[PDB]
Design an enzyme around this catalytic site. Structure first.
Site, PDB file in Angstrom:
ATOM      1  CB  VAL A   3      -1.044   0.050   1.151  1.00  0.00           C
ATOM      2  CG1 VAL A   3      -2.064  -1.062   0.979  1.00  0.00           C
ATOM      3  CG2 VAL A   3      -0.402  -0.025   2.531  1.00  0.00           C
ATOM      4  N   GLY A   4       2.006   1.257   0.649  1.00  0.00           N
ATOM      5  CA  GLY A   4       2.892   2.429   0.746  1.00  0.00           C
ATOM      6  C   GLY A   4       4.384   2.106   0.789  1.00  0.00           C
ATOM      7  NE  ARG A   5      10.860   1.570  -1.424  1.00  0.00           N
ATOM      8  CZ  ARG A   5      11.732   0.928  -2.193  1.00  0.00           C
ATOM      9  NH1 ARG A   5      11.310   0.148  -3.177  1.00  0.00           N
ATOM     10  NH2 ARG A   5      13.033   1.071  -1.974  1.00  0.00           N
ATOM     11  N   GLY A   6       7.468   4.815   2.195  1.00  0.00           N
ATOM     12  CA  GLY A   6       8.009   6.122   2.590  1.00  0.00           C
ATOM     13  C   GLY A   6       9.475   6.060   2.980  1.00  0.00           C
ATOM     14  CE  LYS A  33       8.646   1.697   8.859  1.00  0.00           C
ATOM     15  NZ  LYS A  33       8.874   2.599  10.018  1.00  0.00           N
ATOM     16  CG  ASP A  41       8.495  14.013   9.544  1.00  0.00           C
ATOM     17  OD1 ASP A  41       8.456  15.131   8.972  1.00  0.00           O
ATOM     18  OD2 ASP A  41       8.502  12.942   8.904  1.00  0.00           O
ATOM     19  CG  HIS A  71       9.638  -2.111   0.945  1.00  0.00           C
ATOM     20  ND1 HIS A  71      10.861  -1.738   1.462  1.00  0.00           N
ATOM     21  CD2 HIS A  71       9.817  -2.235  -0.391  1.00  0.00           C
ATOM     22  CE1 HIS A  71      11.738  -1.635   0.480  1.00  0.00           C
ATOM     23  NE2 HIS A  71      11.131  -1.931  -0.654  1.00  0.00           N
ATOM     24  CB  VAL A  72       3.628   0.290   4.329  1.00  0.00           C
ATOM     25  CG1 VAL A  72       2.427   0.062   5.241  1.00  0.00           C
ATOM     26  CG2 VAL A  72       4.652   1.143   5.053  1.00  0.00           C
TER      27      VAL A  72
HETATM   28  C1  LIG Z   1       3.126   1.907   8.453  1.00  0.00           C
HETATM   29  C2  LIG Z   1       2.058   3.006   8.490  1.00  0.00           C
HETATM   30  O1  LIG Z   1       2.385   3.927   9.532  1.00  0.00           O
HETATM   31  C3  LIG Z   1       0.662   2.428   8.705  1.00  0.00           C
HETATM   32  C4  LIG Z   1       0.349   1.678   9.859  1.00  0.00           C
HETATM   33 CL1  LIG Z   1       1.472   1.324  11.155  1.00  0.00          CL
HETATM   34  C5  LIG Z   1      -0.939   1.172  10.006  1.00  0.00           C
HETATM   35  N1  LIG Z   1      -1.886   1.374   9.104  1.00  0.00           N
HETATM   36  C6  LIG Z   1      -1.648   2.066   8.010  1.00  0.00           C
HETATM   37  C7  LIG Z   1      -0.381   2.606   7.755  1.00  0.00           C
HETATM   38  C8  LIG Z   1      -0.251   3.394   6.501  1.00  0.00           C
HETATM   39  C9  LIG Z   1      -0.263   2.855   5.217  1.00  0.00           C
HETATM   40  N2  LIG Z   1      -0.151   3.653   4.154  1.00  0.00           N
HETATM   41  C10 LIG Z   1      -0.046   4.986   4.215  1.00  0.00           C
HETATM   42  C11 LIG Z   1      -0.040   5.574   5.478  1.00  0.00           C
HETATM   43  C12 LIG Z   1      -0.156   4.782   6.615  1.00  0.00           C
HETATM   44  C13 LIG Z   1       0.071   7.059   5.655  1.00  0.00           C
HETATM   45  C14 LIG Z   1      -0.413   7.792   4.408  1.00  0.00           C
HETATM   46  C15 LIG Z   1       0.358   7.243   3.208  1.00  0.00           C
HETATM   47  N3  LIG Z   1       0.083   5.789   3.045  1.00  0.00           N
HETATM   48  C16 LIG Z   1       0.018   5.284   1.775  1.00  0.00           C
HETATM   49  N4  LIG Z   1      -0.209   3.977   1.489  1.00  0.00           N
HETATM   50  O2  LIG Z   1       0.159   6.038   0.829  1.00  0.00           O
END
Ligand SMILES: C[C@H](O)c1c(Cl)cncc1-c1cnc2c(c1)CCCN2C(N)=O
Lengths: 346, 267
Positions: free
Chosen positions: A30-33, A52, A148, A34-35
């Site tokens: 879903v994300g990579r700021g 994560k 942050d 790998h999630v």
């Molecule tokens: C690891 C993360 O902190 C996280 C956690 Cl612990 C639990 N549930 C969702 C998330 C999470 C997934 N994705 C995104 C975000 C948050 C922020 C907004 C950006 N984002 C995307 N996928 O773009």
């Protein structure tokens, strides 16, 4: 190791829980700021989890501190570490969290886009702010700074037992010497832009002030276009266009800031004489005699020593005025915000 | 670093890593087939000193050295000395503890150089051979340590409450240097696995008052604490110094180290 006991080694290897055995995550990035959005493989929960995978290999200083602090922190408005996997072969580290379907970046983006297709509910705004403050107060009482804070880091739980609860996430757990000077500026307090050498509780509170303005208007209050140096001229110009230029009496210690002389060189008080938070917020249909506004103004105080603390903000009469903040920020209403899409990009 | 300072009662240290004394002794029985009880506590003293020396060489602050020492103790509280070589575990514990801090980093070359130098210059009585481990071994060992500890990295110590207690007495100049030193010495024992740190601080402060002939009886009476548990701790501290007197680590440790159970090699 050759000098490690073989029996010890094979016993642990036989018993060690591996992330790929317990969780289905492939294709669920879903994300990579790998999630990843993951489900348990046994099918005993059917709950969604966030996995994560930490960037890099081994256990870096940043990874160590993140694991260290998450392992201790327990509060309803701070994201809760469920489990850590140590992948011995590739030396990769995985962190398991409860999955938060929403966040303020996406929620606000949805309202900002809906404005074009022609506001954010005010009971929801208050409840979100209250929970952000509650979670930050807990971190601060434990001498943990976020360092942050921005809308992307304020998660909101979806359908499930914690429906509409805020979860603060992605704390800046490692900063060398607690320093901003070591390797978006929209949520950064003016003292950072004038060369403050350390992160502070006050710096977090300014960011909450920024988020609160953004929830009220759907626009980042200090929006600005996109190095080592802390001084960012255009971001400061934007702050002053919104807030006005600070008088000597408003921030006496400004003279001590490392970039003060640069500020004097580049800026003139005269430029911002028609500028104030009152004027800015009025244009966006927020009344200056509203309790919301008076609290906002206390959060967005320029001199950090004159900025309200998280605990005092929670005591604000705003939270006692109708409507009361709710534990579910959606207040039992249907959730219109779309779920996060799985990414298939290479 | 004051991160989590007032959270001891809801901490992983308290809820998971304050152990029962009989559970500790039970697990120790497997190593007591090779070493006597005396020899086991002598080994503990030895590796406490090794960790202290490594920490001093790397110019780490006392609290980082203490955290590293606690990591070491937690590992061998569960596992046999044969499982991972304590010579490898000690610098690995220091390395991991240093990474919990954000004020400076310990490099790889610097860690290995420090292990090599400290063992050859300060511990050649115990180690005729050079430090044989390279950085890949430290990194491997680190994964095992973190796993055993269930990722519990934040450790509380008696130094912070001691400092508060002496400042409350108004006797910082007279009593702190001795009391602090005695706190360091408690890491030669199991005390940190068995009692909350503030109780260990109170005991050290009591011993410091007795040694310096300072009457602090009314001040101790003004506290709301279980003095039975404080006296238990005092007895272990007083015993520690008698053990210290009768122990010559320089003459004995080579022989004691040779009695340690050795790792089973692969087939
Ligand atoms: C690891 C993360 O902190 C996280 C956690 Cl612990 C639990 N549930 C969702 C998330 C999470 C997934 N994705 C995104 C975000 C948050 C922020 C907004 C950006 N984002 C995307 N996928 O773009």
């Amino acid at each position: 190791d050759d000098k490690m006991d073989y029996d010890f080694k094979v016993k642990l290897s036989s018993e060690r829980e591996r992330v790929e055995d317990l969780f289905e995550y492939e294709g669920c990035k879903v994300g990579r700021g790998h999630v990843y959005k993951a489900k348990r493989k046994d099918g005993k929960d059917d709950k969604d989890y966030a996995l994560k995978q930490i960037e890099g290999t081994g256990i870096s200083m940043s990874a160590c501190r993140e694991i260290a602090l998450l392992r201790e922190l327990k509060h309803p408005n701070v994201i809760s570490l469920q489990k850590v996997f140590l992948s011995h072969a590739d030396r990769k580290v995985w962190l398991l969290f409860d999955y938060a379907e929403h966040d303020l970046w996406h929620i606000i983006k949805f309202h900002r886009a809906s404005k074009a297709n022609k506001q954010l509910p005010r009971g929801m705004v208050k409840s979100l702010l209250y929970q952000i403050l509650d979670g930050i107060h807990y971190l601060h009482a434990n001498w943990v700074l976020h360092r942050d804070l921005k809308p992307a880091n304020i998660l909101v739980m979806g359908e499930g037992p914690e429906r509409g609860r805020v979860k603060i996430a992605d704390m800046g757990f490692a900063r060398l010497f607690n320093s901003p000077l070591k390797p978006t500026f929209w949520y950064r307090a003016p003292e950072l832009l004038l060369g403050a050498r350390h992160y502070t509780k006050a710096i977090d509170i300014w960011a909450i002030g920024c988020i609160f303005a953004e929830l009220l208007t759907s626009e980042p209050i200090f929006h600005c276009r996109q190095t080592s140096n802390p001084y960012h001229h255009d971001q400061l110009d934007r702050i002053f266009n919104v807030m006005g230029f600070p008088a000597d009496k408003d921030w006496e210690d400004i003279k001590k800031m490392p970039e003060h002389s640069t500020l004097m060189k580049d800026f003139r008080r005269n430029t911002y004489t028609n500028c104030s938070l009152i004027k800015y917020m009025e244009k966006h249909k927020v009344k200056p005699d509203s309790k919301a506004f008076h609290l906002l103004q206390k959060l967005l105080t320029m001199d950090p020593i004159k900025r309200i603390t998280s605990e005092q903000a929670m005591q604000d009469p705003y939270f006692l005025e109708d409507p009361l903040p709710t534990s579910d920020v959606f207040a039992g209403c249907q959730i219109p915000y779309p779920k996060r899409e799985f990414l298939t990009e290479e | 670093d004051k991160a989590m300072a007032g959270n001891f009662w809801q901490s992983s240290h308290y809820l998971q890593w304050i152990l029962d004394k009989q559970d500790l002794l039970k697990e120790r029985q497997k190593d007591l087939k090779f070493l006597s009880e005396e020899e086991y506590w002598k080994l503990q003293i030895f590796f406490t000193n090794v960790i202290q020396a490594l920490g001093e060489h790397l110019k780490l602050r006392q609290q980082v050295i203490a955290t590293a020492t606690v990591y070491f103790k937690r590992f061998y509280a569960r596992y046999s000395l044969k499982s991972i070589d304590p010579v490898l575990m000690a610098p690995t514990c220091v390395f991991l503890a240093s990474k919990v801090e954000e004020f400076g980093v310990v490099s790889n070359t610097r860690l290995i150089a420090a292990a090599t130098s400290v063992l050859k210059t300060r511990f050649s009585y115990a180690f005729p051979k050079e430090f044989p481990y390279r950085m890949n071994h430290i990194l491997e060992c680190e994964f095992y340590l973190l796993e055993l500890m269930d990722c519990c990295l934040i450790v509380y110590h008696p130094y912070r409450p001691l400092l508060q207690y002496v400042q409350d007495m108004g006797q910082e100049d007279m009593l702190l240097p001795l009391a602090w030193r005695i706190v360091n010495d408690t890491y030669r024992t199991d005390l940190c696995l068995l009692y909350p740190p503030f109780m260990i601080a109170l005991a050290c402060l009591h011993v410091a008052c007795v040694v310096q002939q300072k009457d602090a009886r009314q001040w101790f009476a003004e506290l709301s604490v279980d003095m039975e548990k404080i006296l238990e701790i005092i007895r272990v501290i007083l015993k520690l110094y008698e053990q210290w007197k009768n122990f010559d680590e320089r003459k004995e440790m080579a022989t004691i180290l040779s009695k340690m159970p050795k790792p089973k090699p692969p087939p």
